[PDB]
From a paper:
SLC9C1 belongs to the NHE family of ion transporters, which facilitate the electroneutral exchange of cations (Na+/Li+/K+) and protons (H+) across membranes to regulate intracellular pH, sodium levels and cell volume. Rather than containing a partially disordered cytoplasmic tail, it contains four additional TM helices that form an S1–S4 voltage-sensing domain (VSD), and a distal cyclic-nucleotide-binding domain (CNBD)2,4. The S4 VSD renders SLC9C1 a transporter that is activated only in response to hyperpolarization (−95 mV), and the CNBD bind cAMP to enable SLC9C1 to become activated closer to the resting membrane potential of sperm (−50 mV)2 VSDs are thought to have evolved independently from ion channels, and there are a few examples of non-channel VSD domains coupled to soluble enzymes. SLC9C1 is therefore an essential component of the pH–sAC–cAMP signalling pathway in metazoa, required for sperm motility and fertilization.
To understand the molecular basis of cAMP regulation, we determined the cryo-EM structure of SLC9C1 in the presence of cAMP, which was built into the EM maps reconstructed to 3.6 Å. Consistent with SLC9C1 being inactive at 0 mV, we observed no structural differences in the NHE transporter module. The CNBDs could not be modelled, with either absent or poor map features for the CNBDs at lower contour levels, and this decreased the size of the modelled cytoplasmic interface. Consistent with this interpretation, S4 and the connecting ICH3, ICH4 and ICH5 helices have moved outwards from their previously modelled position. The movement of the ICH3–ICH6 helices in the presence of cAMP is propagated to the VSD domains and increases their mobility. As such, cryo-EM map density for only one of the VSD domains was observed and at a lower local resolution of about 3.5 to 6.5 Å resolution. Comparing the VSD domain in the presence and absence of cAMP showed that there is an anti-clockwise displacement of S1–S3 helices on the intracellular side of around 7.5 to 10 Å. The detachment of ICH7 from the transporter module is clearly correlated with the repositioning of S4 and the VSD. Thus, it appears that cAMP has primed SLC9C1 for activation by detaching CNBD interactions with the cytoplasmic end of S4. However, the binding of cAMP to the CNBDs, appears to make it easier for the S4 helix to move downwards by (1) destabilizing S4–CNBD interactions; (2) weakening homodimerization contacts; and (3) partially detaching ICH7 and rearranging S1–S3 to facilitate S4 movement.
Residue numbers in the entry:
A (entry chain A): 71 to 538, 573 to 654, 813 to 951
B (entry chain B): 71 to 538, 573 to 704, 723 to 955
The structure:
């Protein structure tokens, strides 16, 4: 038949409307999403009258809700899940869980009882909770995207995403639970059925996701030098996870997707060094396309069906709703602030204001409102939901995303550190004399003595981006000097092929956490790296439980082996962190004295470094003697890494010098890459000779 | 409504299966596509037996053909076109075109003739051409990978890619043309209709593709620091191009996609490197997915529907068919071997055998066969087509791919040159020396002391993968030594940022062309590099023609009466010309409206609106003319180019006077515009023709830019040659043993160097504009490169955090991109400075 894929013209054409908006409106503070919404609203009026609504451009007007809930939401969730930094997230998971779960529950309940008590169109309990779960899903991408470069503590930058991802994940679960109670009546059930439902939606999801993630990460480490297989495996795995977990067996697919994304992101080492860049870009492109599509459908739908039945009463109600939701978020944050402060980091009074004002609603709420509107057929439900959600989203995008910069400048954390200013000044001045030296060298050239030097001034250089008691002074400068004077050492050794990978981050975070702290020498060894060396946890208690419990009987030895491996991993990591700390402080011990002018603090620093050394020096041997295999295993695994690194730079030196061609060097580099990848998957412990 | 979007899971499973093959049968010489076909054949029967699997495979068993034809084919063709090497393909464009066109036409004709009678099938001639066009589509990817493994000639790979790409592109169009008239006849209308069909399927599509490619390249050239935007505009451009080409406006279709892909691939400079790398990976992934899916449906369909009723003789026919498709194609090459030898690179009988045995069918033919079978309704069409196509594809993949491995070693191109083997042996020996030196360093560590040293054997190094009258020898070995010295010098000049890339690739391919020649050095630039210095294209001649077209008096006589010069300034200001051009552009729409009305209460308005608009435009033109001409007098009549704007006004006045009454007098009721009013309207379309005065300089500057770019490339090539010659003269001076070898080589080098330096000096003297710009560009680009190196050194030294380093980095790349699109011409400085 002459039938054609009518959906191609719209979904692609909409993309173009994004491309103009992103490039043209990037300078203005206002995001392009509101422009996309206005474009969709304008297109809706034209579509209403003219016969331009063919089977295309009109199918989206009555777009099927199940497939959009089944396609858009999983990719929207998984992109943010993949973009996460899992390592820093584990350090505050405990705080984030209590900031997310209870916060979402309380916020949804309060903003539901508000609409139950305020609005005239009477709604029961279920509809109110569906409304609240729709209006309690945030999207603070811009806040972090603009706060990361400001130099603020990365803890806030990761905590914002940690709370937002969990909020979005649980909002869909609550919405789905409370949707079938009103839209799809299925008689009644006893308490046992409810218990089974709760267990299957809360426990089965993450477990299924974890199992699939483990299977795919085990199957991914066995494939060598083939990017296509990795990409195809990941793409098939995520879709299979969601589809099987949601359709064939009734489990929460989105939670399984979240767990799979987090687990895969944690194991990025097994991924090829170049595949993950392509994967990140591809997922980000999908998320951008989905956001553009969702905004345009909202824009076209709202102007025709969602506006016929409104009155000034509702337009007044909208302001009260906005005030209520921002107030509720503020009260939740303030009430939970003492508990957060008591447990670990917490937050100051400054960060709470930004947390409250930094919550921008996103496409998730709009998609849920569209689904609600599509399912319903009357005006009491499906007209208030979409109109209210669109109004709240537009208000937030207009106000908060515009005033966040002024709020930051007022709070004073937008200030640039003076050490950063002087570092930038020195760097630009030295790049200047380097450019001058290069120009001087090019000046005495037989051929290049004729080029006009006006274009040399035109190239110029990147200027400075910023432009614009007797004892308490030298000790602070000494402290901020030693912290990075020791920080540099980890990178210097690692670039030589040292400290594996995890040790670098593990010790740089320990070095920087005490930097913001006042009047305490960093790297105190008080359970900082002692925790990894000890390896104290009930893992061995679980192994003891297995032992007292003990082919089915032969399964227990397999559990014993996996427990042994998981112990040896932590033992090896402790060995690496101890070795790295010792190696770094050995250099800084001779480094410090050259800049330190005052002797009475220089000797204090030397003594405290000696104290930091000898304890960990003894502890390393204490860990070595009990389990001799781990030390020889880690030393052996490090030697091959160093040797392969040296092979790598001699190959690159020959290639750069021109003595080798391109294809032979590429083949040898591929071979050494394969050898190092084979090195990465190695037995945890090697018995001593 | 989407209670179960079951269309997903199967396709995902398909990819899994393919992945498994690529991980399990990698060592096997047979490609994984045979394994995929076996898997599909196995799965088909179990799908038929089990109702649930039949439900899951119902869509595949009933894939509608229209979407398959217009989804997989565009992405496949665009992926094949994108990974192309545009330059080497352009160096043999004529050869590739003639070979592809003639070979495809001849093969299709002979195959149709063969299937006419020998097969004893009840087919007519049109479906015979259908079958011939289906079978003659190839995709030699695996064989090309095999050739590139052992380092076959890059030119051979370029030819075997170009021929295949053009073959598929033309075969798809021929198949569509001879399918539409067969399955859905539209009878006959007019020979002119046939001519219009030929024109719309031949020329329109390439022009549409070129237009969209130019537009998207221009739009992309201005986007800075946005990867997602570039990726999405590229994807949308390709999809919209194919969509508008195939349906709505009716053109060739895939030809437009081919042109767009080639143009985009050639202008990859304006695309940021990460963007093009990501696009390459994405397109090849899509192609792999499409191939996997196509083989999946081929297996399923040949399992359930096809093969049901096949007699014993059909397989016999299959064998015969194979021989045909392995003979005629080869003879075609021979029948064009004497001619193609005279064209470009020529060829050799060994290469003739290679491309004769290197013709492998693939996904395109199977997809077309599947479309035919889906649109079929009986057994003589579709079932036989599927069976024969699958047989030929499987036979080719099994036989040709396996046999060419023996063929290459039995002819002798798989040999490894002993200089390469000795160089690799020395390289791995020195690498092993580095390994043992590192082990010696690290075996005495205060910490890494108890590590077991047996793992050194684990480190090891790759053993050589190859494993296994006196004048002429020193001449040839010395010549090869000079050649390698040259190319390593050029690579050094590049990595230090001194030679760009186009000059490098051109001159190194000249180098290896001289290398394969018999005792021939790079030789003096008689035309090998002198051509790059002489812009002997007709472009400059056309520039002279444009200049004489634009020839006019620099300053018209200055009026003095009444306002005088100010009035002349009114009649010669750029604002007045811009206003006249804008008036012409705005009245062009009235011409379109009048034409639409003539070709056709709605008409009541147009009965007078067109006349009113025409009168207003005529009055505006008369006022503009009154603004000019005054004071010039005879100078107004002297300027014939300017006077050409008065004939349109005279014609408009005559038409207005005639149409005022048309009954009172003048034309009256004679044979005139009274009979047909189009004569009044058609003349009104001439006013838009008085606009080339400002358009000519645009193409003048375009040609100037083209010739300046050619001059810049020539200067870069000369710089590279002279620098490499100096370095080699300073390096080899003591390497050469025989005094006479040194004398001959140094004399040849001296002749070349002191010829090329004088040629470059003459070029600089005659046209100082381009050389200065080239020097400035090279200086600033090397300055930026060294600044980037210093920034990277600072990052390595940890003086700055990595995020500030990245900020300075992308600022440097922004400056570099601003450098790339800078004009290639710089005015000379005044002598005072
Ligand atoms: C970390 C995860 C996020 C944190 C927690 C997230 C969500 C909360 C968790 C679990 C669900 C509890 C929330 C609703 C409380 C009532 C649960 C309930 O009652 O369920 C039942 C489920 O019965 C079923 O049909 C089970 C069959 C449905 C499965 C698919 C087929 C709702 O039907 P019903 O019989 O009660 O109807 C109400 C009857 N009247 C009005 C007379 C009381
Ligand atoms: C770079 C290019 C590479 C390849 C080079 C060549 C490309 C094109 C090549 C070969 C085909 C051209 C000559 C084909 C002659 C028949 C085509 C023909 O005549 O079309 C006409 C044109 O009417 C049309 O429907 C086109 C107008 C309507 C457009 C929408 C349909 C089809 O009417 P018909 O008389 O054929 O119907 C067959 C009647 N019987 C069976 C009695 C003869």
């Amino acid at each position: 038949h002459a039938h054609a894929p009518k959906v191609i013209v719209f979904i692609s054409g909409s993309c173009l409307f994004g491309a103009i908006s992103r490039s043209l409106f990037k300078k203005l503070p206002i995001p392009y999403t509101v422009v996309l919404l206005i474009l969709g609203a304008i297109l809706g009026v034209v579509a209403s009258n003219v016969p331009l609504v063919e089977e295309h451009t009109r199918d989206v007007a009555h777009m099927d809700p199940h497939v959009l809930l089944q396609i858009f939401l999983p990719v929207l969730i998984f992109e943010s899940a993949f973009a996460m930094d899992v390592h820093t997230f584990m350090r505050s998971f405990s705080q984030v869980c209590i900031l997310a779960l209870f916060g979402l529950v309380v916020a949804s309940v309060l903003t539901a009882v508000l609409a139950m008590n305020l609005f005239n169109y009477n709604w029961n309990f279920s509809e109110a909770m569906m409304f609240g779960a729709i209006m309690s899903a945030t999207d603070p991408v811009a806040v972090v995207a603009l706060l990361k470069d400001l130099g603020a503590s990365k803890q806030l930058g990761t905590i914002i995403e940690g709370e937002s991802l969990l909020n979005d994940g649980c909002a869909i679960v609550i919405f789905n639970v409370f949707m079938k109670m009103v839209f799809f009546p299925q008689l009644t059930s006893t308490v046992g059925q409810n218990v089974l439902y709760f267990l299957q939606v809360a426990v089965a999801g993450p477990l299924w996701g974890y199992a699939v993630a483990k299977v795919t990460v085990f199957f991914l480490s066995h494939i060598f030098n083939d990017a296509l297989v990795e990409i195809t495996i990941t793409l098939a795995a995520t879709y299979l996870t969601y589809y099987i977990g949601d359709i064939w067996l009734e489990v929460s697919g989105v939670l399984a997707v979240v767990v799979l994304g987090l687990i895969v992101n944690a194991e990025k080492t097994s991924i090829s060094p170049e595949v993950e860049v392509f994967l990140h870009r591809f997922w980000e492109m999908l998320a951008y396309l989905a956001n553009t599509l969702i905004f345009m459908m909202v824009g076209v739908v709202v102007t025709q069906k969602a506006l016929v039945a409104v009155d000034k009463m509702d337009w007044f109600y909208l302001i009260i709703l906005y005030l209520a939701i921002t107030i509720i978020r503020g009260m939740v944050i303030s009430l939970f602030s003492p508990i957060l402060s008591r447990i670990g980091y917490g937050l100051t009074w400054r960060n709470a204001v930004i947390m409250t004002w930094g919550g921008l609603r996103g496409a998730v709420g709009l998609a849920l409102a569209l689904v609600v509107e599509n399912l319903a057929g009357n005006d009491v439900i499906g007209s208030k939901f979409l109109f209210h959600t669109a109004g709240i989203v537009v208000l937030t995008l207009v106000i908060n995303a515009t005033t966040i910069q002024t709020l930051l400048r007022i709070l004073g954390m937008s200030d640039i550190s003076i050490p950063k200013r002087l570092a930038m000044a020195g760097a630009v001045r030295r790049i200047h004399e380097g450019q001058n030296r290069t120009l001087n060298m090019l000046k005495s050239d037989r051929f290049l003595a004729d080029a006009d030097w006006d274009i040399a001034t035109a190239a110029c250089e990147i200027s400075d981006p910023y432009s614009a008691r007797e004892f308490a002074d030298m000790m602070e400068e000494a402290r901020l000097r030693m912290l990075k004077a020791e920080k540099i050492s980890y990178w210097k050794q690692f670039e030589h092929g040292m400290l594996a990978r995890e040790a670098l981050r593990l010790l740089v975070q320990h070095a920087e956490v005490a930097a913001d702290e006042k009047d305490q020498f960093i790297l105190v060894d008080d359970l900082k790296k002692s925790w990894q060396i000890k390896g104290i946890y009930p893992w061995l208690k679980r192994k003891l439980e297995d032992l007292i419990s003990e082919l089915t009987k032969a399964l227990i030895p397999k559990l014993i082996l996996v427990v042994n491996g998981k112990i040896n991993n932590q033992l090896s990591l402790g060995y690496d962190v101890g070795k790295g700390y010792i190696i770094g402080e050995e250099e800084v011990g001779k480094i410090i004295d050259r800049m330190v002018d005052n002797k009475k603090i220089l000797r204090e620093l030397k003594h405290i470094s000696e104290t930091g050394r000898l304890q960990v020096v003894k502890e390393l041997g204490l860990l070595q003697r009990e389990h001799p295999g781990i030390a020889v295993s880690v030393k052996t695994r490090q030697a091959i890494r160093t040797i392969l690194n040296h092979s790598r730079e001699t190959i690159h030196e020959l290639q750069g010098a021109g003595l080798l061609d391109e294809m032979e060097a590429h083949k040898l580099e591929l071979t050494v890459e394969i050898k190092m990848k084979r090195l990465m998957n190695a037995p945890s412990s090697i018995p001593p000779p």
